[PDB]
Amino acid sequence: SMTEYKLVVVGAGGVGKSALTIQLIQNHFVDEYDPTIEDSYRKQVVIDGETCLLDILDTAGQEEYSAMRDQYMRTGEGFLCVFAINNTKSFEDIHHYREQIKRVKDSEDVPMVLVGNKSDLPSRTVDTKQAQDLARSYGIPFIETSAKTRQRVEDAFYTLVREIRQYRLK
Ligand SMILES: CC[n+]1c(NS(=O)(=O)c2ccc(O)c(C(=O)N(CCO)C3CCNCC3)c2)sc2c(Cl)ccc(O)c21
Ligand SMILES: Nc1nc2c(ncn2[C@@H]2O[C@H](COP(=O)(O)OP(=O)(O)O)[C@@H](O)[C@H]2O)c(=O)[nH]1
Ligand SMILES: [Mg+2]
DSSP states (O other): OEEEEEEEEEEEETHHHHHHHHHHHHOOOOOOOOOOOOOEEEEEEEETTTEEEEEEEOOOOOOOHHHHHHHHHHHSSEEEEEEETOOOHHHHEEEHHHHHHHHHOSSSSOOHHHHHHHTTTSSSSSOHHHHHHHHHHHOOOOOOOOEEEEEEETHHHHHHHHHHHHTTTT
């Protein structure tokens, strides 16, 4: 009695993809994780009464032209699209990551959650209203997280599971 969910964490270099994934899985914060390390992590969790196996790919390179990225976008069931709230460029990059994923899926139905990470940093450059507007335009949830303090880390991943579970019934 278990359901599998293949999750992919994408976003510009330095936004906190690794720190979020490691906080979820290993309950610690990494200060300076090698940006080129790409790995998968598995863990069983209970969400809405369901024992869920999360299979999460923490992506490293974000290159347009990558056979491996095409493959993991085909395989991935949901996408955590992460920007940092103090990096406007990373928020602008989100549209490209969504376009790439939709292209690979040949679909509009793609489970995705917009994550504004580094919510513990005081010098915000991306207003929450703008990020909420973007998420509303895409029809996806928006969550601000801190991999440093663990704020909303489980919520971001579990919300993505909920999106996938729902899309399976449509
Ligand atoms: C690793 C298996 N895997 C995938 N396998 S895969 O497409 O062949 C793939 C994708 C990216 C990769 O970098 C790799 C890969 O070669 N690796 C990382 C994943 O284990 C190796 C791992 C050993 N060190 C170098 C990188 C494989 S896709 C995937 C998704 Cl979308 C979610 C969860 C997964 O576990 C997953
Ligand atoms: N203050 C703060 N720093 C973070 C947060 N998440 C990641 N970082 C830091 O930002 C840098 C990049 O994080 P990393 O996870 O390696 O980014 P990735 O390239 O997206 O995998 C590192 O120095 C992290 O310690 C966060 O929520 N808050
Ligand atoms: Mg990383």
